[PDB]
Amino acid sequence: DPMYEQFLQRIQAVRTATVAKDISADILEARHDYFGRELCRALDIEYRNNVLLDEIILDVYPGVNLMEYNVPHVTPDNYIWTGDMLLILDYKVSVGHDSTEVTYKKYTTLILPVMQEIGINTEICIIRANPVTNQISIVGEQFKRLFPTIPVELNFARFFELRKMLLDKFADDEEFLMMI
Ligand SMILES: [Cl-]
Ligand SMILES: [Cl-]
Ligand SMILES: [Cl-]
Ligand SMILES: [Cl-]
Ligand SMILES: [Mn+2]
Ligand SMILES: [Mn+2]
Structure with a gap:
């Protein structure tokens, strides 16, 4: 697992809270991207990870003049263009609902x-x-109708193992415990 090994190398070497904070954030990003890839594979949909809204619009409506509209330059993770409806997708990996509510409000x-x-x-x-x-929890009624089952095989254990080693290495570092 090249991803695991690269994180492990970084945790073996890190000495400072600020660099450790970046490893922690990077592991959480990789865990998110892992879920996105497994999700799209299981549904046989195109995998993307952050598409500019202007690019989405141009894919679904090639004749658009972007300059006529006030397009917020957000980058949702992915989208599905069925030919009649546009599903904007964002992946989350979280034990809680707060990050889902924040992104749902922003994109709505x-x-x-x-x-x-x-x-x-x-x-x-x-x-x-x-x-x-x-x-798996889904917000999006039309997504649920298109994909009533999501036959993914998820295994997050290695992301937990890596981040726990990082937290243990800095368990006595006040500067780090605050950043996290
Ligand atoms: Cl360091
Ligand atoms: Cl965004
Ligand atoms: Cl598509
Ligand atoms: Cl997430
Ligand atoms: Mn994203
Ligand atoms: Mn996301």
Whole structure:
């Protein structure tokens, strides 16, 4: 596992709280991206990880003049263009709901108004994996109808193992415990 080995090398070598904070954030990003890849593989949909909204609009509506509209330059993780409806997707990996609510509010209020002006039928979809239990939670009614089962095989144990080693190495470092 090249990803695991590279994280392990970084944890073996790190000496400072600030560099450790970056490893921690990087592990959480990699765990998120791992779920996104497994999710798209299981559903046989195109895997993407952060698409500029302008690019999404140009893919679904090539004739658009972006300059006529006030397009917020957000980068949702992914999208599905069925031909009649646009599903905006964001992956989450979390034991809680707070990050889902934050992103749902941001994309609902920033994306839906301009998509209505352009004329593209759009739904905001947030798919969250609980990394401890592997349970999947979906916000997005049309996503649920298209994908009533999600036959993923998730294993987050190695991300937990890496981050726990990092936390243990800095268990007595006040500067780090605050950054985290
Ligand atoms: Cl260091
Ligand atoms: Cl964004
Ligand atoms: Cl697509
Ligand atoms: Cl996440
Ligand atoms: Mn993202
Ligand atoms: Mn995401």
